[PDB]
Design a protein around this ligand. Structure first.
Ligand SMILES: Nc1ncnc2c1ncn2[C@@H]1O[C@H](COP(=O)(O)OP(=O)(O)O)[C@@H](O)[C@H]1O
Ligand SMILES: Nc1ncnc2c1ncn2[C@@H]1O[C@H](COP(=O)(O)OP(=O)(O)O)[C@@H](O)[C@H]1O
Ligand SMILES: Nc1ncnc2c1ncn2[C@@H]1O[C@H](COP(=O)(O)OP(=O)(O)O)[C@@H](O)[C@H]1O
Lengths: 370, 52, 370, 370
């Protein structure tokens, strides 16, 4: 059985979908898990009353949105259950897991119960013939065509650099960090209450994140630009409400490199990248200086890479050529690299048959991921 | 309309609808990034031959 | 087995009644409790000592009319029975309490004790097989067919901004202000003494209502149209006399937007609806202007919604597209929507079963209506 | 200045006033902002036309009582000025701003704009030399003598546990929330309409508040006591008009733990306290379990803290010994603690020299108010 392989982008920030060979992820939508905030009495509301998809994508303040992916790690598997049921929706795919080769992705260092649980679903409820839960930076290696390289990722509450070389077992040098825009936008809600902007809902948070993705730049100088006089850009809400900003628009992404703003003890992912460089060797370091990849949808900012490049230069060694390759569509690029790997038929060794999962499971996971 | 004629307790000259007036990314170009495109078909068929 | 229900559209001031599936409430007359005021003498002098309809119009200043519906909230339950008996009679129903299912209308958030009192009537004195009583706004929405909709409607001594959306129970946003045209007629009585007219009878009040619903409207400018010199429209009294009017006719509904004239700390129900909008969600608020539903015979006036349009223009910010929907049968829109639900088999799940009321009552009543 | 330092008891609902060294706040009064609802055409009536004190605390329905602290966040400013002029009234002070050191208290995360307004007031209108603006829970720690503790405030529309440890700046760990009994009493006005009580005035709301502060409590068993039926004890109006109390007395304050009764998603601030616990550390958590403070007027209910004890018992794990501390003088704890801090020599460095502070802008004490 070799039908078209399912490309399952396991997007923590924004989940994406489609099959291999498709040069564009057909279905793309975030981590939102809704069901109505209110209670409908008269008919006129839609049916299912746990909505994810266009209904949720058109009724924000109506559905009680939730998120199981605590730092991209789903806790409410039930949400994923319904999501995967929605994967074969009449709008979506209308097919079977049984009917297709399936491919999964995974940010490393997650607790084994996560991918084990997911595989339980896909081999018990769903019944995939052959599958595998790959990593996520390899997708970017396909998108770049590279083999050697540092790959930064960006979900919603997860961001980390992945130093790679031709797919080699370097997990100590390879890093993982679970922090991103989720709490940055929550910190933006903090800014809101800091200056009287009354905002607390999840749908309200969606609006906040939309404007965050919209009205938030990155000033290269941290305090030299942070201590300036702000114009407080009056963002007129989608409803029409005029709302100023302040330096907060670039202050909140500094937290990603100034974790002490929230009080977290960290270094800045670029410093962790430097630690990965230290974990690598002098010859391989230069390659990584030349090979850096920024990916993930949360990386989208104004003055983003120039600032981070400058910060790296502030911490880089003597005149070593720092080079960051970049995919223009960091959201797409991931799913598309996964589409490449799914369309790669050498996966025969790399997959996991259903029977094998029934026999071992965890052992089959490790022995096939290593 | 026929029901509007039927019952007596019905007002007339009613434009029932009254509406108001009506009228009718940037960092992919950022200098310091080495932003690359892919054309996955070519590189895919290229690396596709890597029977590993 | 059940029978054909009777779509009975009540209200704070006017009751409408017809069977299921009909297009016209065949039995319409206002809500009033009349009974004689004089010493009966000769033979043939109509006994019953409570008279409604042709007898009421026939003996206007001869029958003491009562209105126990304290803004719809009635207190002469015994007389309510008799009103229904008048309907039960060969005049209107020609049937029994058990011969047909009943349909009835309910204003929002009234004291449950009243409802329960009516249930005592309907299932002990009267014996309804099955019934259900709910929001008139919902019925009006059935008539419009809309599901997403802010229903602005007013009874006769009750005003109520009802922001609804696909049957969603949003009682926090949903409001009601139990004051309307009954008091505007009382305010017209105030105008009567202001021009020296002691026409305080209930029949005199009916004459006041006739001219009220007859000669009044909403001038869009308040004092630009009020402070000028009037013509004092010589309204020819039906008696054969004539009384002038002046600006008073359009000055009286200004109180509906300016409750300070009567000395009331309301806001002009349109503003209360704006607050209801403020209790909703930002972009959904935009849709509420599109989801504008207007009703109420009390609201049936020239430039009514137009003045209200200007009001909201002076209240709502830009990017607001009001979409008024006020037919010529807003009274019957509730009755016709009741006929729609009467044509719906959803009532089988939405009834008030006699048996369960006999078993529990109050708790079962709220379990039936909620 | 070498005088008695003023301790502003800037209470949300009840904004009292006083000095340092004293144990009783000089004058106690709420956020009432009255202006007569009529016109004294007859000479010989009472002056003022703005009422703070027994003038309003004696006549309520005659005056358009107002309240600008939108969950503590005051919107009026001119009225506040006049309130502070009244602070210097004959009965009140007969002193000068220059003549006395003044200390202001505030809720955390308030807008800087309010402090700017206060600077304008006490530096342009008033001229306090020694003016400092502070927090409110620190005051409670002064009164209790504790340094480590979970301080739960209880205002009219502001309640939030403040987990402190020796004054350590834990803004991320510490949680602020602006909601309390205001809309609970208003929700009881909703109950009033559901029980037939036509009340719409803030004065009427104050009478309901007299019931709130008087005939209300927290039933530790939520539905075990809610699903039952009380005898609905009767409350007497200022006239003495008999009005039943009902189950509402404990049903309405459940919204404080069940915020979805109003529809607003929240937790019941004890769970937010648990979130603060999560932000804290394991054994330091135990200290704060043993260190919980209950201040604010709205804490006064039967089984209040005991019900919350049961809540955390249903939340905290096993062998978790928790201890609360609810001083009898909840609001005064803040006032007396302000008297304590205002009576300090180190406290002289807390404020900034008046004129220079005006020249320093506001950001200086904005950075120094932590
Ligand atoms: N301009 C922007 N600024 C910040 N975040 C953005 C922007 N555009 C998209 N996003 C983010 O895209 C992210 C999606 O990440 P994604 O690429 O799907 O990573 P993953 O696949 O690991 O979830 C979301 O977290 C959302 O915050
Ligand atoms: N043309 C009119 N102008 C003003 N008032 C009217 C007119 N027609 C009817 N009314 C009054 O307005 C009320 C209609 O609003 P509706 O919601 O049907 O009231 P109710 O709930 O009192 O039956 C009627 O009770 C009637 O007294
Ligand atoms: N006996 C009482 N029971 C319940 N609440 C009370 C009592 N006495 C005062 N209050 C409440 O105190 C609140 C007044 O707000 P206040 O406590 O002054 O704000 P802050 O906490 O900022 O000082 C109101 O909620 C009022 O109901």
């Amino acid at each position: 059985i070799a039908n078209q392989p399912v490309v399952i982008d396991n997007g923590s920030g924004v989940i994406k979908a489609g099959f291999a060979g498709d040069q564009i992820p057909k279905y793309c939508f975030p981590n939102y898990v809704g069901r109505p905030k209110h209670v409908r009495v008269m008919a006129g509301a839609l049916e299912g009353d746990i909505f994810i998809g266009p209904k949720a994508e058109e009724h924000r303040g109506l559905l009680s949105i939730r998120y199981p992916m605590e730092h991209g790690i789903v806790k409410d598997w039930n949400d994923m259950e319904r999501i995967w049921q929605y994967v074969y929706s009449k709008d979506q795919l209308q097919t079977f897991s049984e009917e297709h080769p399936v491919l999964l992705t995974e940010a490393p260092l997650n607790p084994r119960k996560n991918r084990e649980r997911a595989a339980e679903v896909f081999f018990e409820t769903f019944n995939v013939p052959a599958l595998f839960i790959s990593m996520q930076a390899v997708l970017s290696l396909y998108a770049t065509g590279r083999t050697t390289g540092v790959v930064l990722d960006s979900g919603d509450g997860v961001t980390h650099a992945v130093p790679i070389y031709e797919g080699f077992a370097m997990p100590h040098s390879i890093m993982r960090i679970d922090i991103a825009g989720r709490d940055v936008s929550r910190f933006l809600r903090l800014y809101l209450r800091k200056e009287g902007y009354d905002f607390h809902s999840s749908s309200e948070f969606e609006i906040v994140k939309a404007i965050k993705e919209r009205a938030c730049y990155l000033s290269i100088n941290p305090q030299k630009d942070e201590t300036l006089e702000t114009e407080k850009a009056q963002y007129y809400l989608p409803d029409g409400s005029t709302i100023e900003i302040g330096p907060s628009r670039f202050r909140a992404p500094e937290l990603l490199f100034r974790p002490d703003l929230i009080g977290e003890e960290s270094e800045g992912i670029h410093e962790v990248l430097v630690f990965a460089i230290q974990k690598s060797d002098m010859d391989l370091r230069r390659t990584l200086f030349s090979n850096i990849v920024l990916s993930g949808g949360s990386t989208l900012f104004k003055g983003f890479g120039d600032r981070l490049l400058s910060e790296v230069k502030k911490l880089a060694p003597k005149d070593v050529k720092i080079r960051i390759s970049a995919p223009q569509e960091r959201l797409y690029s991931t799913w598309i690299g996964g589409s490449i790997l799914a369309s790669l038929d050498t996966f025969k060794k790399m997959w996991v048959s259903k029977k094998e999962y029934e026999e071992d499971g965890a052992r089959s996971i490790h022995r096939k991921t290593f | 309309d026929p029901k509007y004629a039927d019952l007596p307790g019905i007002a007339r000259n009613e434009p029932d609808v009254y509406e108001t007036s009506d009228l009718p990314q940037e960092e992919l170009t950022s200098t310091s990034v080495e932003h690359i495109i892919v054309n996955p078909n070519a590189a895919y068929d290229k690396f596709k031959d890597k029977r590993v």
